[PDB]
């Protein structure tokens with residue numbers, strides 16, 4: 009296990025050998041084997057997408073190209089989307105088309121495989137061969153970093169929907185005045 | 201079967217071995233064998249025709265040649281309808297006559313064939329030799345796409361009869377502000 | 393008494409009594425709430 | 434307005450009818466000392482007539498070419514025009530009370546059928562039982578729909594006697 | 599409203615060809631299913647209506663597909679009716695369009 | 698069986714045994730003689746009670762919190778129009794259709810529960826979530842994903858006790874909501890307004906003084 013979520017407790021029996029398992033299942037969602045066998049792959053994929061998303065949200069702002077929210081504004085407004093500074097002359101419809109074609113073929117190729125190959129495909133997805141050499145610890149690494157990134161992406165969306173600022177802008181506004189610039193101070197999150 | 205449209209329910213027994221069956225028959229319209237055979241043929245043929253129809257309705261508009269409703273108007277009140285931007289030198293009378301002759305020949309040849317060869321006649325209608333490698337699965341895909349396309353064509357008709365727009369225009373209008381321009385906002389669908 | 397109440401339960405008397413009660417009730421309702429053409433609530 | 438019928442509160446013929454009927458009663462008044470029993474009766478009648486004509490105008494009933502209130506008997510074309518109290522609401526009210534009486538009688542029949550002398554318990558009613566069932570009949574929509582969904586409301590025709598074709 | 603000759607001739611020839619080549623299998627199948635009319639289980643000929651005796655000039659033909667003269671006349675009648683629908687409708691010049 | 702009844706001295710009907718939670722032998726109209734109808738009525742009472750508890754909470758708690766000086770939300774009757782006049786307000790028809798479209802899915806799921814109380818737990822129904830719909834052997838008490846804290850999920854008789862508490866509170870809430878509706882129809886004031894009004898003059902300000910309860914024609 010390594011973890012107990014609630015320090016004292018009794019944890020679900022089916023959660024024991026999984027990578028980065030803390031017995032977190034008070035709802036009994038993965039009790040049957042098939043539900044858990046699907047939810048593991050769903051969580052890993054969710055974590056990878058989150059890690060990449062959080063990387064993008066930090067990178068689009070830390071380097072100096074704007075928010076993670078204003079990203080799609082130059083898509084309408086007449087036209088013209090910016091990527092590092094290029095024009096990428098591609099209207100809205102062709103973006104949806106090209107991305108739909110790419111994600112359809114990719115997601116229809118990665119899923120049509122066996123359950124283990126659906127989440128942990130060695131093949132060319134381990135070019136540096138770190139898939140071997142005791143991959144349980146590395147799987148724990150991946151899953152925990154993915155959980156952190158999921159919460160990070162959720163926080164990005166929520167703090168934008170509350171204060172309207174930006175990750176780095178919100179961080180700066182908090183660090184300047186930790187005292188009256190919290191979630192408790194904007195009259196959205198904490199109401200009382 | 202694979203599916204049950206009302207998960208916790210019991211399905212009719214005559215709907216099991218059929219491809220793309222979900223037990224969906226609340227009116228018992230297939231309670232008789234010969235009736236169900238005719239219905240199966242008619243469903244597949246309707247699916248094919250509606251796939252062609254939906255593809256045409258979308259491809260005349262995404263390619264940019266007017267919408268499906270105003271395509272036959274120029275033939276009346278003038279003449280020489282346009283295809284790909286060209287102009288056929290045919291009137292409504294000769295169009296109706298040529299279509300009647302050709303469709304009569306085609307559907308008279310189809311209708312005189314064997315029961316199964318009236319709906320799945322591979323022969324020269326499968327040049328790419330795809331009916332092999334267990335067509336059952338392929339039949340299910342064809343039926344489900346046909347069901348989707350049939351519902352889409354009926355949707356084209358009803359949406360144009362209610363709002364008077366065009367498929368992509370209605371799509372864009374709903375996407376712009378869904379919570380206030382769905383079907384519940386026009387004065388037709390909802391008698392309020 | 394028991395036979396008198398049995399007589400009061402006979403169809404000729406109980407029917408007439410119930411018609412009298414319902415008639416009186418409609419007459420009272422129309423006396424207090426007259427000229428009501430619609431169910432105005 | 435629902436079909437060329439202006440609200441009685443607007444129709445001039447409706448007010449004219451009010452006027453004429455009141456004027457007739459005034460002419461009947463002008464013969465008695467306004468403190469005698471006939472005079473009090475006439476004054477009460479006039480007050481009742483005025484109250485009725487004001488009540489009808491308040492509720493927005495529709496008057497025709499003549500000054501007489503009209504009613505609407507189509508749900509939807511009366512619900513989107515504020516005239517559901519004309520036929521639809523009294524429809525519900527009747528259907529309810531009629532069903533109440535019918536269900537009370539039906540259950541009384543089914544209760545006294547399973548007794549010693551069922552032909553006797555129809556001419557000499559059991560008043561406590563009749564009254565109990567009359568009280569239970571108020572929930573008749575619920576109980577009747579329960580018996581229909583149960584199949585115990587009706588009887589299969591294989592058990593009902595029929596004529597020789 | 600453009601040449602009675604062309605429209606009526608083309609329509610009639612097309613209808614003849616359509617009833618000889620295209621609709622003939624279904625026509626013959628339906629005719630074989632239906633059959634001669636029967637009263638009380640016997641044809642009108644067996645019952646004694648010797649005028650209901652089948653016309654002799656249709657039982658055997660010389661068309662390799664069995665296209666009799668009466669078939670020709672029925673299909674030509676349909677063709678002429680359709681052709682004159684075409685003519686009479688194109689001859690009018692009024693807005694019937696519900697738009 | 699020997700439990701307290703709605704009327705002490707009047708015996709309970711021989712169909713309202715003593716097993717259902719909230720059973721006080723109250724059934725003067727004999728609506729629940731049929732067993733299947735009794736199950737459907739039990740389930741209906743649960744739904745009405747739960748929705749009435751939610752509604753009466755969302756009526757009094759905002760009202761009392763407004764009274765003391767917080768949140769200053771309108772009174773429940775006009776709260777529909779107060780939102781409806783807002784700028785970016787969803788139109789009523791579209792809003793009602795959104796609500797009805799969501800509740801269609803949810804309530805047909807609960808319905809298929811009510812028929813066979815294990816209906817929605819068949820594998821392949823949802824996307825792995827179908828296990829949380831297994832039910833608890835009685836309709837109206839799903840458990841699983843519902844009841845996250847596992848309250849009463851221990852001693853059986855503990856669950857029986859909480860069931861009586863729930864049903865009593867729900868019955869109180871429905872009676873109170875009927876009270877709110879009838880009070881606002883009569884006196885165009887709020888619930889706490891009526892409460893603070895009655896305590897002022899209990900013999901003068903009541904239901905026999907608003908003039909809408911007792912018909913003015915009679916008096």
Ligand code: CLA
Pocket residue numbers: 534535536537538539541558562563564566567
């Ligand atoms: C409670 C008794 C009862 C019940 C449940 C019914 C029910 C029914 N009757 Mg019926 N009927 C009854 C008594 C009853 N009737 C009596 C006493 C007579 C003799 C006058 C008739 C003569 C009669 C005829 C001629 C017809 C029906 C028909 C019908 C059916 C159509 C509904 C209708 O509108 O009928 C109409 C109702 C009446 C014409 C008169 C109703 C009599 C009173 C109002 C009810 C009696 C209540 C009872 C005396 C009180 C007992 C209460 C208890 C506490 C003691 C329906 C199933 C029609 C049918 O054929 O079905 C389609 C039909 O044509 N009935």
Ligand SMILES: CC1=C[C@H](O)CC(C)(C)[C@H]1/C=C/C(C)=C/C=C/C(C)=C/C=C/C=C(C)/C=C/C=C(C)/C=C/C1=C(C)C[C@H](O)CC1(C)C
Pocket residue numbers: 032033034035036037054055057058060061062064065068075076077079158159161162
């Ligand atoms: C476990 C459990 C179990 C038990 O039994 C019960 C309970 C307790 C309930 C539970 C819980 C759970 C949870 C918590 C969940 C959550 C999740 C999440 C948050 C996800 C995220 C998720 C998220 C994610 C992926 C993310 C996404 C995003 C992304 C990618 C990004 C995008 C982008 C970018 C790049 C940039 C640009 O410029 C913008 C955009 C375009 C926008």
Ligand SMILES: CC1=C[C@H](O)CC(C)(C)[C@H]1/C=C/C(C)=C/C=C/C(C)=C/C=C/C=C(C)/C=C/C=C(C)/C=C/C1=C(C)C[C@H](O)CC1(C)C
Pocket residue numbers: 224225226227228229246247249250252253254256257267268269271272350351353354
């Ligand atoms: C199954 C069942 C059974 C149970 O038991 C009961 C119930 C429930 C009743 C059921 C259901 C039903 C349903 C849903 C139905 C529907 C159908 C449809 C939608 C059809 C359509 C169908 C449809 C279709 C085919 C369509 C087709 C189309 C087309 C050709 C088109 C053409 C065109 C185009 C291209 C375009 C142009 O510009 C014009 C035109 C020329 C016009």
Ligand SMILES: CC1=C[C@H](O)CC(C)(C)[C@H]1/C=C/C(C)=C/C=C/C(C)=C/C=C/C=C(C)/C=C/C=C(C)/C=C/C1=C(C)C[C@H](O)CC1(C)C
Pocket residue numbers: 723724725726727728744745746748749751752753755756772773774776777871872874875
């Ligand atoms: C038991 C029995 C049996 C025997 O045998 C017979 C008899 C006697 C008949 C009986 C009795 C009965 C009764 C008493 C009943 C009653 C009921 C009720 C009241 C219900 C309610 C019920 C109620 C309910 C659900 C309610 C609900 C509510 C709600 C949602 C609310 C909502 C809302 C809110 C929040 C606020 C806003 O601003 C407005 C609104 C929107 C409005």
Ligand SMILES: NCC(=O)NCC(=O)O
Pocket residue numbers: 046119
């Ligand atoms: N047989 C396909 C399958 O197992 N799919 C699982 C998923 O939805 O990821």
